[PDB]
Amino acid sequence: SEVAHRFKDLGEENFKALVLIAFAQYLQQCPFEDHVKLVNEVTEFAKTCVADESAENCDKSLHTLFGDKLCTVATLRETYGEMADCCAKQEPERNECFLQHKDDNPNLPRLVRPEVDVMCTAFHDNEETFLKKYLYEIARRHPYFYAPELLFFAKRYKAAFTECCQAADKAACLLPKLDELRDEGKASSAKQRLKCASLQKFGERAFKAWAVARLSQRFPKAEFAEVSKLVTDLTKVHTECCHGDLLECADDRADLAKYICENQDSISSKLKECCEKPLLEKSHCIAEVENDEMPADLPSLAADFVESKDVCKNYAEAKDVFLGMFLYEYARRHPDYSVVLLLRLAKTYETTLEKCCAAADPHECYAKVFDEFKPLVEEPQNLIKQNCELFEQLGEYKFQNALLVRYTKKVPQVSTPTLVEVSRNLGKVGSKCCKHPEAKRMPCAEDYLSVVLNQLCVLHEKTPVSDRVTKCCTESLVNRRPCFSALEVDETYVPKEFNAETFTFHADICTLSEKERQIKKQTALVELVKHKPKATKEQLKAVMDDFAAFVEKCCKADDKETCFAEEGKKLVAASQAA
Template identity: 45%
Template sequence: SIFLDEICQVDKLRDSYGDMADCCGKADPERNQCFLSFKVHQPDFIPPYQRPAADVICKEYQDERVQLLGNFVYAVARRNPFLHAPAILGLAAEYENALKSCCPESDVGACLDAKVQHVSVIKERAKHIGVKQEHGCRILEKYGERTFQASKLTRMSQKYPKAPFAELVKMVHDVKDVYKECCEGDMVECVDDWSELVTSLCSKQDVFSSKIKPCCELPVVERTKCIVEADFDDKPDNLPSLVEKYVEDKEVCKRYESNHDAFMSEFVYEYSRRHPEFSTQLILRVAKGYETLLDKCCKTDNPAECYGNAVEDLNKHIKETEDLVKTNCELFNTHGEADFLKGLLVRYTKKMPQVSTDTLLEIGKKMTAVGKKCCSLPEEKRMSCSEHYLSIVIEDMCKRQESTPINDQVSQCCNTFYSSKRPCFTAMGVDTKYVPPPFDPMMFNFDEKMCTAPPAEREEGQLKLLVNLIKRKPQMTEEQLKTIAGGFTAMMEKCCKQADVDACLGEE
């Protein structure tokens, strides 16, 4: 409130920020929510960060350390509006560590370039962490505390499989409280409470995980990032099968009905700590499937018989996800990035042809980046990686859909459970209600730029042509597409060799 009161006293607030000034007419907490709603991913009036010359940086670090680091925090924060304060301070610590080790060197610039903490890497990491933290806030805001806590309990049970259930439940509750403050923009409390949470975790590192010991020896601002990125602990040996406790036990319905949430939380904990290779979303789907089964079976005369096939039923979720990851990674690793992107563009243009060509290209590139990042990992890490990042892409798409509806099937998928969205989008077929717009020759404008433009621009132009072609004929089969692609390639090979490229393209 104090910060917002000060902002609202600024004389020319409307000149700089337009409609945001209207927020000052509201009372808290609506005023705060109003200000938060004006956050944008990449403010277009802020130029890209340019690193000063090496000698200038080092002199400023030596003479004006506080000012230099303050400017760094300012530069990162205004370019990454969704990044939480502890992450920004952690990046500033990384930046300072790079300067400390490089400034005494003879070639400071080369040292900074070679450093893992090189500024461009820090910029990328800032974007990456910002997207993840915004996604966490979105889950908390849109799906509520129960889904957020289930998601965190899943992940933390995988990461700390030796920790007792009660300790993890308390930690998850604390994480939720801290996230609420960070997401609401209270950055002072956000820093303070994260610091307390990490200190508490480090005070019980023997209970949680041996993997966080090196992190807990770091300065406070560097601990959080280290702990978040630490490896999963090894799961305990000889964990018993869950079938006996959750399927064969005659008291299952009694335990489920007497304390529904506690029962399901313990199931998520037990299942997650046994399956570090599964994605959070898959485990939540399995838990939802089990919960739905118990809701149905516990009302029957013979519940045990009703849920006797629980394992087979739940394995369907697992097989769908495993098959999808396997198929897509085989496609990516066999055919490469370019063909993978084309395949995605064909599929997603058919699913939602109403979306603009540029946005479809943006979505396709983001999904291809997921393939590139995740399919290079060891097999046991691929599912978790790919579903996590795909969920972020899909959630962003659904957020846009709220203000600009796409079609009925996208609306249906966006309104389903958080964990079910990705399978819903995967299973989505061609939009049969879509009526292609009247033919516009400009959508298929062939000129000599298609031969003379730089390779990246040519590739982009061809991808847009592909999307526009599918928009015209969403029912087109793969064979028809191959025939057209072959004809297009032959035309380009022929015409790009001619003196009058435009005439050749027009004739063809």
């Protein structure tokens, strides 16, 4: 028995929670009730396997059990049409079918939230179904959410109500903590979506490279042999969580924290405080610890990597280990570099050793390698420096609007909603990183753009409309940013054509929050740039200036929200003029 295994390790709480998340992430459109049912039928079975370890099918692989359970509702194609197919499949992958069918953008209605007076009551009456509903909603809207981390977000979500419901001003104590969590959750989710895309679309060697750089940056004092161990394990953990195997991922993840904390003196000195607490908190801590201080007297890289005469020979012996050692050695002394830049230098070095080593005189050919690193390193520095300056003058909103115009011109085929969402997130880097010392600016900015751009890539892969996006997304994981910065204005795009249904105006806008108001304005700008790419400099503003006027007036005029229809057609006349 395996299901027996995981049960004993995670116990009832966690085991039950993880299974729900797994089920919710597979059948995102399936109602809460049904999921709870299967989860229970599923948990009950488990309990018997514990006692009798060969009873029904207790001898099974979680994949058959889980699969069959879901298939008791999936065969209902009138609800989940294309799902029934996966069910008719077999063992080798009646699952590859499921994972392949995950929606990164489910057509699930907005999740609005009941007055502080209800959530509190509902929470107190039944604390179980309240928290269960949380995970269900998150996991079903974020099919790649790092499961073990979702359990941590849950323990915090509970503590939010556990406390604020006992306030004097609940709405005051809650609202905050609830926002803060909604944001941090969308981040953790994007951070993880990139980790799964790497493994799934580029391979484990790719993820392994990213881990070596990252870990070496964080734990400079750690030895190469140690980092590899860590990289090996961490890779397996994420491979499982991304293959849909959450129970083993959670288990293995706990084992790693245990290890890392045990060999504390051998890895980092800033681990102490993470090793002193509740596991879930210990795991989230280690994963977010600050880099350790850099080892005092460190030799120069040129020594064993460009000046040694045995370079080519060692490369031939164990290239992967050699290049791994290079990356580890370069990253440990450069916490001021982003992880993609470090991977760019490593790829440039390998490429050089390849052509150089088959030469009539290596050491002569590869002897000036660091000369090619210069441009690679300066490029992001200049980009960061310049976009931060600009972001400072215009602020976040105006900056976002700049990227919006820019990016819609780059790839006009992309759907407006994605452009708006992506441009917004790109602008949010300014507030997030610009306020940092140049020593921490690049790692902050560039790696965050690797997450934001990945989101655009996974969202585009759904319905590919621009081969330029496909190319930049597929050609290189590490050069995605550089690829997109290089893109200019699509000279082959043909302007859209106005039609009524293009943009709808109903008064319903005057009720929405300040945010959804800007958003509707940004959605307008994108639609504008799609209809008038070229002609655009400052007619854009002049017009956007006009759109604001429209809303202001019509929302505060007291006619039926009629002017909306009349004046709606009025502005269109003006717009076209420009």
